[PDB]
From a paper:
However, wild‐type ct PTF‐Las1 still co‐enriched Las1‐Grc3 together with Rix1‐Ipi1‐Ipi3, but not Rat1‐Rai1, and all five subunits remained stably associated during extended sucrose gradient centrifugation. Since the Rix1‐Ipi3‐Ipi1 complex is known to exhibit a large hollow sphere with a diameter of ~9 nm in yeast (Barrio‐Garcia et al, 2016; Kater et al, 2020) and the reconstituted ct Las1‐Grc3 heterodimer a butterfly‐like structure of 13 nm × 7 nm (Pillon et al, 2017), we conclude that we can observe the entire rixosome by electron microscopy. Once again, we observed the spherical density, which we attribute to the Rix1‐complex, and the butterfly‐shaped Las1‐Grc3, both arranged in such a way that the shorter edge of Las1‐Grc3 is preferentially oriented toward the Rix1 complex, with a distance of about 35 Å. While the cryo‐EM reconstruction of the complete rixosome could only be resolved at low resolution and did not reveal any apparent connecting density, both sub‐complexes could be resolved individually to resolutions of 2.9 Å (Rix1 complex) and 3.0 Å (Las1‐Grc3 complex). Accordingly, the Rix1 complex resembles essentially the structure observed on yeast pre‐60S particles, composed of two copies Rix1 and two copies Ipi3 (Kater et al, 2020), but without a rigidly bound Ipi1 subunit. This suggests a flexible connection of Ipi1 to the spherical Rix1‐Ipi3 core on the isolated rixosome, but on pre‐60S particles Ipi1 becomes fixed upon its binding to Sda1 (see below). The hollow sphere‐like structure is formed by two copies each of Rix1 and Ipi3. The Rix1 complex from C. thermophilum exhibits a highly similar structural organization when compared to the structures described in S. cerevisiae and human. Strikingly, AF2 multimer predicted with high consistency an interaction between the Las1‐CC and an intertwined bundle of two CC α‐helices formed by the two C‐termini of Ipi3. The predictions agree with the previous finding that the Ipi3 CC domain is essential for Ipi3 homo‐dimerization (Barrio‐Garcia et al, 2016).
Author numbering:
A (entry chain CW), B (entry chain CV): 2 to 44, 52 to 469, 512 to 596
C (entry chain CT), D (entry chain CU): 1 to 393
The structure:
Amino acid sequence: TAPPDLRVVCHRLASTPVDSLPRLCPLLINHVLRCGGPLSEPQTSETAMLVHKFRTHITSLLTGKSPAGRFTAVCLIKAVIDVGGWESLRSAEPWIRGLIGVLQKPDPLSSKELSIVTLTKLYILLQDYQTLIREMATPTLPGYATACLQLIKPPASGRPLKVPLNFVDTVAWSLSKLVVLYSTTMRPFSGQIKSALRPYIAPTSSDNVVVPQSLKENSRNLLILLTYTAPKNGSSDEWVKAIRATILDCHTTADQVFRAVRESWESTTGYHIQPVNATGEPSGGGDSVDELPPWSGLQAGAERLTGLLEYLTAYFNNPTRAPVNVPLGELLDLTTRLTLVIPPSLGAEDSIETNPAIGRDEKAELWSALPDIHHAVLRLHCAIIRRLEANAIPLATDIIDQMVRVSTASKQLPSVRETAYILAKEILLLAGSTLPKLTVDILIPLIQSSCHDILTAAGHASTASPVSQAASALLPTFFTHLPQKHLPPDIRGLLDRTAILSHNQSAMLASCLHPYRDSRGRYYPSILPFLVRRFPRDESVEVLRS
Amino acid sequence: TAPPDLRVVCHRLASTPVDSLPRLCPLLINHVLRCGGPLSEPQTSETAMLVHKFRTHITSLLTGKSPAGRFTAVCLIKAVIDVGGWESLRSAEPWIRGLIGVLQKPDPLSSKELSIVTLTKLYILLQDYQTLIREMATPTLPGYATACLQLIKPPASGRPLKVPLNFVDTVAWSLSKLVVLYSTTMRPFSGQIKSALRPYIAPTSSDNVVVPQSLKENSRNLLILLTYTAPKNGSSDEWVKAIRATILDCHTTADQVFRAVRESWESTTGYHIQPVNATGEPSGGGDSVDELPPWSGLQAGAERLTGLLEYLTAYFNNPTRAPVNVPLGELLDLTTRLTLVIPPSLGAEDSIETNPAIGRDEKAELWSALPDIHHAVLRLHCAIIRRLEANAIPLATDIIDQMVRVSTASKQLPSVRETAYILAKEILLLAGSTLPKLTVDILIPLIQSSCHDILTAAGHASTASPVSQAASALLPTFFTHLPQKHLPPDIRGLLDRTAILSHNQSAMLASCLHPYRDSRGRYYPSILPFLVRRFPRDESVEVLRS
Amino acid sequence: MLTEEFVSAICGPPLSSNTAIAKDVGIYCHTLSPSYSVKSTFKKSSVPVNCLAVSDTHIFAGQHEKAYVHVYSRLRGNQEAFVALPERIRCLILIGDILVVGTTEGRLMLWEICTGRLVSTPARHVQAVSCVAATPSHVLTGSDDSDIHVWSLSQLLELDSAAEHEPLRTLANHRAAITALAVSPSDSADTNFCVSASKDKSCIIWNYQTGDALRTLIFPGYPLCMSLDPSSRAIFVSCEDSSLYVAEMFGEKPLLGPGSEDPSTVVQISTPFGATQPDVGPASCLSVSYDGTMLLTGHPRGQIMRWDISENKSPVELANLNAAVTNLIFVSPFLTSKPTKTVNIIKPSQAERAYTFTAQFEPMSFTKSRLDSLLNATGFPADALESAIVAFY
Amino acid sequence: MLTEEFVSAICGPPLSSNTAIAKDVGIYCHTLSPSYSVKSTFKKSSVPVNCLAVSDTHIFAGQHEKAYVHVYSRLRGNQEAFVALPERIRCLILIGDILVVGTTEGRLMLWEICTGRLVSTPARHVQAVSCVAATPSHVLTGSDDSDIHVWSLSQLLELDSAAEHEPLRTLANHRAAITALAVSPSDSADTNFCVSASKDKSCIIWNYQTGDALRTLIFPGYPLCMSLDPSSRAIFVSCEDSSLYVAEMFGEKPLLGPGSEDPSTVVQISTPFGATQPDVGPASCLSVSYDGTMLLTGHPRGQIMRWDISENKSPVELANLNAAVTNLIFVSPFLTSKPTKTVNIIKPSQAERAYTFTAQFEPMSFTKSRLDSLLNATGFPADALESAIVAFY
């Protein structure tokens, strides 16, 4: 006798009209995920008969002309490939051709997105078995890539995108997996993918279109992962050339951004700031393949610089096929150049050296636009730390100096402060324990700001805030990974009060495990009573009770 | 001199065309969030002049006929009320009338949603000051409620809903806050809100419309929070009557669901199972106000029972204005009745007593539909535990018996297992430490299943799964909050191996702090070397190093 | 950096006439930190030792030679209820929302404040239950028969049982009436301990789930009232000789731990932390503040005296209540979050009814949505705003 | 429940002829658990003691009386590189992706495997650096001048520093050449300790960041090689008298902790855990398995001996390599997750260039999207499927 789930599936597939099937898709998916075992059996028992009729119904739903039926078949194929295994993968070939045909046919775009996800899952699952790669993936894949590139190609000369940018995000997400898996098959399409993904790498205000963040992230991911398709093992060279071109593009945009301010910065690597015309607004970019789309205006230039910095972040986010040379010195010099330019404090506008030919409005726009560039620089430093781990220790002093200068210049923005807290946690986790006294002294205002934000959120000096959560995460690190001997007693008392009033178990525990010894050589009292009173039965106090 | 941000805001608002302003909204919002201080100043300096021009331009954008201008004004009003404080709140009255006018005008629905969010934030912020409540909130609020109820009212006799269900979700979310804040003003609209939210409480397959989960959750939340508007302090009585009516509705649907199975259950409270006609499919519901919409079919009845159980969960999720009587005995009897009916294992179909007049297909559909009802029961138990905390201790034995019976009946379903793990963690956190031997013995297969799921995810016996994450969270609780003396040595060894191979710090730490002593009266070796080798510098081992 | 408050209770007749104190008041509420003051008073109460329990909403008071419990509302500021119990009360405490009551007959009852159940155990103790302590998992009752019975909360509280209840364990190394009971905040089997004192001038630290006796201490006078420090590192003990004693369990020689001696050995504590002049009298109630640096004692002659544990200075008298002070309960300065609130109590009724729970449900943000993230964010989030602009065009 | 592997290294000429062992092999790879076997061998290597470092991808070997480092690839299975260093090498270890090398001249260098930098310190040690141990924050070098210099990694590794480097501290209580160095996994200032051994038959446990000497131990023979247990609870010490000694830091009387004596007092370890017959010889290299239950020793006569720490039985001989065994390094059975993989090394060049880092970036799921949640879920998630059906109609 068959399991109840399979015969329920057969009866509901036979009885239901095709147009109401998408509404019954959740229960059908639940039932077919339940009966994975009958489909896993290699192909008379009633179970095998019902499995054969079920697969016949799936094929008839897929091949038949009904958008509701095609949608239902897409969902059923996804669930069946999820639960069946090798036996379903053996017969998935007419299903693969059917899903590509669904993408070719004019259907609702959610059905196309689900077909894209199902085909991506099919290729990832077919990667295990080489014979099925030869039979299925290699012939069907160029047609799928052509069908996707047909959708996301911009006919911008005649008309704008009939495909929404979320669907472009979906296609870029699928191709990001497939360039990693099948490099040689996806190699002919790289020139088309680059031209399709050119506008979404660093959008500006002059582009006059709103680009979703996920579209930019997946566009950058796909252009970085396109180095896998480089012929004759040229992946690393293409990666190095691309990242160095991005660094040079950052520098050239930074020239036109910092036209208003005389720059004392001189390059370690050997970059030279070209003369910039004082007449007119800053401008740049171009229609060339190597150049990003043109921009005009100081805010658009700041947006382009921020997008280029996010592209450099996405370089460290994505993996590489072969070992690559990472120009840490060039990135360090670039970030030093961008962080050296700081906006004046109130009443200190005349202190900063500026070109007299620049108008006051451009100066005001530059002072407004600087913290976003600084925030992108700090996020780039965070990604560099996350990828390098212990190899980012030699950059710690320069990243500390940049972070202190940025957080001092833009102290009144909560977002810059939050990014500074997130960066400072990783900095102290790497190289905070062995810092000299002067580094601790310049780090002191950041500790004061973080404690003030935590106490403001707790209301002891209110609702939770992302800057408050970042500072609360930073708070145990000030005890664990900072030299207590370099801290003044006022800072330690502020840290202890912040830990107590914040009810932070980790910070209170870290203050208990790292006592502070002052000049008189006698330890201050521990905050253990507060920790045991607030968290009596927690696991950390249980470890203390060992 | 003015701050740069405010002058940039004024220049960009003056120069930009109105239709391109929604694309410039993110930078405008960032700049106006930057200059909160000039707007916070109580109202010649250039700062005050630019603030006055900025507010005048916001008012001109809002009152003028431009959907892009109205959208931009909505965003600017939200940010200005966020950063200005009392000085913006005292003048937000033409802004409040303008936002209600935006809701009345035919505009894009995202602008309407943003106006709804902005008006909700305005009312929540106006709640602090009583004079502004008398001047602003009380007159303007019935118009806003009428404008929302005009949108979400179904003209189902004439046409289906012109408004998408996500917008109905938005309106229900806003009214959920406003019934809590302003009970007396929102009191006349409760009869309309109930009629509008009737279809979304327990949708079935017979309704032939797909209801988003957030719509059901916020509909249940709003109908529970509508008890705040009860006159003459009648909130608690309405709450008790509503929850008891829901329990009776669960029982009446359970009769028509379990018509196929002879039930040995007898009620503690005094409910009696009415005779059910064996002929035809099960059916129920009605068009009455007290009754939920009609259903027909066993799967639709199971969906109705699941929706009613989720409604009972939402009862414990939402707060109450006054102390209420919670019928824990009736809910316990109802859950006992639903969990007593279990589907047979393979080869044991004839063991379960069934009515001979029922067809075999209906029996198959019932066996398929039982695990979802059981999962809803377990989620109801989780919500009851979460709300009651230590007051749920008397129900612990019955919830343990129900959980063991459900997880044994539906062992092959990962979702039922995941919900059982989540319930078991809370059960053991409440009353696991003092369990008798027989309860531990019946809990043993759940421990075996959780360890098997963790080891399958780790691959030592693969990608992370929600059932795997639930079992990994449950894993330290088996050491901390379960009697180790009642566990057999095989179960303890399996737990230790699972903790080691899972690389879970918390379970290894808990096994270190809770040693196992066998019948031979000497302790097993600890797993501390694995913990120190895998996590050398973590904080818990640092506490161990005290 | 904080304000700290405590609740006092007096008993008996007023000691001195013409002192201008109110004769009707029996319960006071004070502010210990920053400066001494009195917030509010409660009238018509006479509470013996160990019969006062304080929650965030209610104060429960056991009456002298009288089976009633007076329940006062801290929110409204008046007396809420006159609860009647079957037998006269020697001691009562409050765990969660359950009042645990010992009697002269030796019975134990648990009265659930919200549901109105009165779970009454058989009289396992031969004589009066003198002290009660509780955990989330166990309830420990010390009586006049020198037996400390350890009971499971889960077996007592659970519903469908009609059989008689039994204790899990009995700790009977004491040979006289149990005067005090204090329990460590740990509920784990290995790391927990309970500290008990008896009339035979003996104080035993037990592992109550295993039943073993970890440590034995001997005092020159029998212990009246006891309290552990918030770190669970020290014990403060008042005695009949008008003195306060401190015991460091992790000091030079640890009482408990790797450096401790054999559990069969006996440690004698003879150095007083402080002494009290006999016109003030031996301290009848003993409480420790939240920080643990500073301590409070109540005396039968009316004086409430503050001791500096860290400074080790002489005690200073806060006020003279002109009546025998029996209870001092500290209230935590920080407020905890509990998903329910007990506005009103439910009196115990023996009538058969369905199990009902009565409390006010509190806003706890259990329901989360993306619209809440839109609302609570300053301005609008970038991705949600981008989706809004895409939906607009 | 696991398989465990270790890497051996030999030195000198083959001891016995006609034993049919390969004469050209210098490095072996074995499987200790479940059963003894040999996976692969590496050719043409002669490694003295403390000159072998093993990573997941490469094996670095210092050559006897020769300034070159032979780098072998564990992935490809062959010799990768013949690295040339300025001075002859006494010892080298590997921390992260940095090879830390001590010399006969007393200098210390750090060679970054990925970037090719060679940071060379001034010769602070008067004579040869004999042992090197590492911390993620510090580097400890013991030399023949009895001074253990504690250095900061951050000051050595940083780019723009052109001044000469200096040690943070010098630990000089020893009066002879430092033979061995062990570092506790704790990196905190208060809880860390480093264990050092010298030729004056002394073994000092220090707190190297404070510079204090926590404990002093005296052995009958001077310590050759030392290894700490995985729990950091015991020390295993080999000596010149062909015996192995075990010292428990948290045993009956703790060497470190609350129950310990004064740090100026001296503890003498005189009871051998085991002894070795002199035809086998004293153990020259010492390693502890992942579980810590079993231990491995290498001997100058070729025998690799496995010791049962828990069982305390007689040692058994795994194999005779017919050459003096100088290094045994255990490889962790579980594989750790690292964002970068070092496929190839970069040889140190003194030429001026921009700072470049060379590694292969590994898939780490740093980029997360909702489409990934759609893909990895079995079937489709309920809310995403509901939104799909709404978008369909």
